[PDB]
Design a protein around this ligand. Structure first.
Ligand SMILES: CCCCCCCCCCCCO[C@@H]1O[C@H](CO)[C@@H](O[C@H]2O[C@H](CO)[C@@H](O)[C@H](O)[C@H]2O)[C@H](O)[C@H]1O
Ligand SMILES: CCCCCCCCCCCCO[C@@H]1O[C@H](CO)[C@@H](O[C@H]2O[C@H](CO)[C@@H](O)[C@H](O)[C@H]2O)[C@H](O)[C@H]1O
Ligand SMILES: CCCCCCCCCCCCO[C@@H]1O[C@H](CO)[C@@H](O[C@H]2O[C@H](CO)[C@@H](O)[C@H](O)[C@H]2O)[C@H](O)[C@H]1O
Lengths: 1044, 48
């Protein structure tokens, strides 16, 4: 190949251009994301039972669906909540790599068996099955800037005109309306009902009969009589469309023939299907759509599709209506990636500049400069072939590959240069000779070096895709680098390099640069005898190395470890949780304080606040809420004090003053589904039908014992709600029968009035919507109100509820949890400072073993995730180390010589540990990928020292110490090129501020510190490594001066 | 130990064991060799 393309420069370019075109196309089509998808798919079943308390929901709906959940492939676990809103959510979590389409299909096939078994009212609310992330992708806000539409108006406009199309959009897994669609609201008055001997049963019957759409056939319908000339549809009752029409529904006609109309016993208005969720945007009335990303969908693509759908709606907005953008996780992905693109470009330019400083010739440095983008664009084309994505790890691979790539290009250029610079061949035959003797080495060394990355292509589980995508990128790059070095680079040396002749490297004809050479010259000798003096040494220069090694293993274990760092994503959330029993009004009081704080005490940082009353992470409720905070752009928030961590800490500290509420701001974790990394997710289980009260007691016991271990366990807390007062009313069956009042009339009256009843549908401005019957607010607030409602007996008498019932206060649960079909309580907590999570989990299991009989436990979520064998690095690094030694053995045809290359490894590790230590970083993903990079290039430096030393002893036949010296820095100048150009190339990462700089700063200081030490140290120790190894591993009939 | 009849053992596994076994990894269908307890109303046509 090298010769073939030397004689065919244009063919060479054609290959390089096809490669770049393929890469370029890949860049225009590859998905873009923060990370490879490592989230296990999760299917959610949602149902609603209007007016139902939590136990009714659990025992009439949840248990029934759960008992039907069997024969579902790849299911890891199942959890559910049933609450006193009437609402159920069941979450089925699957193994990673489960097809979410099939999971959804399997879940719904089982659900359909349960459906006929569900209460009619639950079925008619619609139950749904969704496959989406649990966090919000974005919140699309809607306000009215003329204030000519209220909170309720806006919410109805959103539900009726925007929501369905956003819900049908591909990639949109779930949509939450912050607000409610309108419904025809029939607000009943028990005084007037009783006045006219009517009940809510009569009201319901009348609506079903007089708000009706009836099919009435046709005149001259088929089959017809012969001679028919007319055919027309018959139109009878149609759905009612206005409050006026509902108002005139005829309940009954009195004795004297007077009319009792619905509007005589009820106030009739448009109003929400529900009144629980109320949203503000910067204190202003708002509605919105909380959008969740469908399982495995691309966030950036779905955000685009949503925007495009929104744009289609806007021209038809009523006046003043406007879309705002209070919370979007998506711009952080696009911007952080583009920021990595920016440092990649800067890295190239900085490599070019250091190219030019050493190799003074412009055409000689243009050659490696050209190689870099051909290889990197090709690499994108390979990523495409492997179905990978453009993400933080693949992008970092691109940046970190540069050192490796540059070396292949320089080794060719420099060999050709100082073939001309030591004989007198024109560039065309100079490169042919030169390629003739290095192409084996080239191919060879790349195989040795890919061995330091290939094994780590094989991590397992959710952590696994992270290192796979980095490893395949680097190895793909290194492969293409060798390809380009055999094809393009020889061609370019053969056609772009100027001839030289004469034993040349010239001191006098430029100004600044001619000086640079002359310094480096006797800098090279002041370096050579530095080595010569540390060769007559060996003794305690060895001891120093073992100090670096112990100092290395010391610094290692001291360094804490984690997975992925938190990033400032320019957004965050604030949770508001009041005690169950707390009114909507009080939750608004607390939301007001949270809004106030961001609006007045974070003016510089907070751009907007979208606060929602009645919605929380765990689901609907009068006592729950959430604030979505969007921050000003990173560039306007300089310094640690203005980043999400300090902001949320400051905010949580402020909010801790707030009375009778749980309020805290928190950054969403790097990935989510992995959890903050001291945190454990604990499930307490009723294993023997103990029941809710006994379970609570066992939970309380566990929490108490945990509290008296702050040395190991901190913030160990229940994730659910506490019991609250409930109004227990007993229907007396005997009195009911005696009086002639039916239990169905009693229960429909009780429930329709205090709980509300979805009667049927009506048509509002062309859209089908619901009709609800319920007591007007003022007749369902006080316990004494119960007796103001009357039912009609069979004999026509009106009987007050007080006649056939009794009542008492008791305690009950507003949110019943179940884990894997069993009653449960989720307990949260973290390992105390300086302790590992596993230690906290241990103590937890110990504490749990002393709990009452029939109480079990389990680990879920994040805790499940890492009990799933999560520590493979050591054996993988050991395998990688082994294959490196073997590959090196092959390269040198020796078992012992590879050791002189491999001893360089701690010299680079010590730098990384020191750098990460002094900048307070962690041993995380960005620390591990960074060190393999350094080890790869530190290896490559040491290899070409030893390569020279061995070939000077075998081809030239020169003695040991003396061929080391010649070998030693015939290569210093190329090694300082290589290393310093890489070091200044990762510098945009270390000095990176702005979006994603957390990852850039992290991966950057590890590599930089490692490479800085790896090369300054090896350049004195690699000379030593060689000679010491060569003596311990004999051959007692050489050293001193052969020829042959 | 003579405390549980056959009907009893069947209810116990139906009510406490079957559902989880049936969600266990790689388990297809699951057949109970017995029956779960129901509330049994045994009517008497004479007394009716
Ligand atoms: C040294 C050379 C190698 C370094 C260069 C690598 C840069 C990689 C970062 C690119 C990140 C991907 O960003 C990607 O950009 C292209 C161009 O805007 C977008 O492409 C978009 O606009 C272009 C036109 O401008 C259209 O052809 C395309 O239909 C549209 O999707 C992709 O939708 C986006 O996902
Ligand atoms: C060929 C030359 C290569 C020689 C290099 C030899 C030096 C060793 C390199 C670094 C050692 C690996 O560092 C190792 O990383 C793993 C994987 O994330 C960490 O593992 C830990 O990480 C995170 C956070 O706690 C969890 O997801 C995981 O469950 C946990 O075990 C270990 O705490 C750490 O010991
Ligand atoms: C050519 C490679 C593309 C580089 O594109 C790079 O993108 C980012 C993000 O969009 C741009 O602009 C960025 O500036 C500031 C810097 O903190 C950010 O806070 C801001 O969100 C963004 O607009 C950079 O000015 C541009 O250099």
């Amino acid at each position: 190949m090298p010769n073939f393309f030397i004689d065919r420069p244009i063919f060479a370019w054609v290959i390089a251009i096809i490669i770049m075109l393929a890469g370029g196309l890949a860049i225009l089509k590859l998905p873009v994301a923060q990370y490879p998808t490592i989230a296990p798919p999760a299917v959610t079943i949602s149902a609603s039972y209007p007016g139902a308390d939590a136990k009714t929901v659990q025992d009439t709906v949840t248990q029934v669906i759960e008992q039907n959940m069997n024969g579902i492939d790849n299911l890891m676990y199942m959890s559910s909540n049933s609450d006193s809103t009437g609402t159920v959510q069941i979450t089925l979590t699957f193994e990673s790599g489960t097809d979410a389409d099939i999971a959804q299909v399997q879940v719904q096939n089982k659900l359909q068996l349960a459906m006929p078994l569900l209460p009619q009212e639950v079925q008619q609310q619609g139950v749904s099955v969704e496959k989406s992330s649990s966090s919000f992708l974005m919140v699309v806000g809607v306000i009215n800037t003329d204030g000519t539409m209220t909170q309720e108006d806006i919410s109805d406009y959103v539900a009726a005109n925007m929501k369905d199309a956003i819900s049908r959009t591909s990639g949109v897994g779930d949509v939450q309306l912050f607000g409610s669609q309108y419904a025809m609201r029939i607000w009943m008055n028990p005084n007037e009902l009783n006045k006219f001997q009517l009940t809510p049963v009569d009201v319901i019957t009348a609506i079903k009969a007089q708000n009706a759409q009836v099919a009435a056939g046709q005149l001259g319908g088929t089959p017809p009589v012969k001679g028919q000339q007319l055919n027309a549809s018959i139109i009878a009752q149609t759905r009612l469309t206005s409050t006026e029409e509902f108002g005139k529904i005829l309940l009954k006609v009195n004795q004297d023939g007077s009319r009792v109309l619905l509007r005589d016993v009820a106030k009739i208005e448009l109003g929400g299907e529900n009144y629980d969720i109320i949203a503000e945007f910067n204190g202003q009335p708002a509605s919105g759509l909380g959008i969740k990303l469908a399982t495995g969908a691309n966030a950036l693509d779905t955000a685009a599709a949503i925007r495009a759908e929104l744009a289609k709606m806007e021209p038809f907005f009523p006046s003043g209506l406007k879309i705002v953008y209070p919370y979007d996780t998506t711009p952080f992905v696009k911007i952080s990636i583009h920021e990595v693109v920016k440092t990649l470009v800067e890295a190239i330019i900085l490599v070019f500049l250091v190219m030019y400083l050493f190799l003074q010739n412009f055409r000689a440095t243009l050659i490696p400069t050209i190689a870099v983008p051909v290889v990197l664009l090709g690499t994108f084309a390979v990523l495409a072939a492997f179905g990978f994505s453009i993400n933080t790890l693949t992008m970092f691979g691109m940046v970190l590959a540069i050192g490796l790539l540059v070396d292949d290009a320089i080794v060719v250029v420099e060999n050709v240069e100082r073939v001309m610079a030591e004989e007198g061949l024109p560039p065309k035959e100079a490169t042919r000779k030169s390629m003739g003797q290095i192409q084996g080495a080239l191919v060879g060394i790349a195989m040795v070096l890919s061995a330091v990355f290939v094994p780590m292509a094989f991590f397992g589980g959710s952590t696994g895709a992270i290192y796979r995508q980095f490893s395949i990128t680097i190895v793909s790059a290194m492969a293409l680098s060798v390809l380009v070095a055999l094809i393009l680079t020889p061609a370019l040396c053969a056609t772009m390099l100027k001839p030289i002749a004469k034993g040349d490297h010239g001191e006098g004809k430029k100004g600044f640069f001619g000086w640079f050479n002359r310094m480096f010259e006797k800098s090279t000798h002041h370096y050579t005898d530095s080595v010569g003096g540390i060769l007559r040494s060996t003794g305690r220069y060895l001891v120093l190395y073992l100090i670096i090694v112990v100092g290395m293993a010391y610094l290692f274990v001291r360094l804490p470890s984690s997975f992925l760092p938190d990033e400032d994503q320019g957004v965050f959330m604030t949770m508001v949780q009041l005690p169950a029993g707390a009114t909507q009004e009080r939750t608004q009081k607390v939301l007001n304080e949270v809004t106030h704080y961001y609006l007045t005490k974070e003016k510089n940082n907070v751009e907007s606040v979208f606060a929602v009353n009645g919605f929380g992470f765990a689901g609907r409720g009068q006592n729950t809420g959430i604030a979505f905070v969007s921050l000003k752009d990173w560039a306007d928030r300089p310094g640690e004090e203005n980043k999400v961590e300090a902001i949320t800490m400051r905010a949580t500290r402020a909010f801790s003053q707030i009375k009778d509420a749980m309020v805290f701001a928190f950054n969403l974790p790097a990935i989510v589904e992995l959890g903050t990394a001291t945190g454990f997710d604990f499930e307490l289980i009723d294993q023997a039908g103990l029941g809710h009260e006994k379970l609570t007691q066992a939970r309380n016991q566990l929490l108490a014992e945990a509290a008296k271990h702050p040395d190991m366990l901190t913030s160990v807390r229940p994730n659910g709600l506490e019991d609250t007062p409930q109004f227990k009313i007993d229907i007396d069956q005997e009195k009911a029968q005696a009086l002639g009042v039916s239990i169905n009339d009693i229960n429909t009256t009780l429930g329709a009035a205090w709980g509300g009843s979805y009667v049927n549908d009506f048509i509002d401005r062309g859209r089908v919507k619901k009709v609800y019957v319920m007591s007007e607010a003022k007749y369902r607030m006080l316990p004494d109100d119960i007796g103001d409602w009357y039912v009609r007996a069979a004999d026509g008498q009106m009987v007050p509820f007080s006649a056939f019932s009794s009542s008492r206060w008791e305690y009950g649960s507003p949110r019943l949890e179940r884990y894997n079909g069993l009653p449960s309580m989720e307990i949260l907590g973290q390992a105390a400072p300086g302790k590992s999570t596993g230690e906290a989990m241990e103590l937890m299991e110990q504490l749990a073993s002393k709990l009452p009989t029939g109480v079990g436990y389990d680990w879920t979520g994040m805790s499940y995730q890492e009990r799933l064998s999560g520590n493979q690095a050591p054996s993988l690094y050991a395998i990688s180390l082994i294959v490196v030694f073997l590959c090196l053995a092959a390269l040198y045809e020796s078992w012992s010589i590879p050791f002189s290359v491999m001893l360089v490894v701690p010299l680079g590790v010590i730098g990384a540990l020191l750098a990460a230590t002094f900048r307070g970083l962690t041993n995380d993903v960005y620390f591990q990928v960074g060190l393999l990079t350094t080890i790869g290039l530190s290896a490559k430096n040491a290899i070409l020292i030893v390569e020279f030393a061995k070939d000077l002893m075998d081809k030239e036949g020169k003695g040991l110490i003396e061929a080391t010296l010649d070998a030693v820095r015939m290569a210093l100048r190329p090694i300082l090129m290589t290393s310093l150009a890489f070091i200044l190339g990762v510098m945009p990462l270390v000095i990176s501020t702005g979006a994603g700089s957390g990852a850039q700063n992290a991966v950057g200081t590890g590599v930089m510190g490692g490479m800085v030490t790896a090369t300054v140290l090896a350049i004195f120790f690699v000379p030593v490594f060689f000679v010491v190894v060569r003596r311990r591993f004999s051959r007692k009939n050489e050293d001193i001066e052969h020829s042959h």
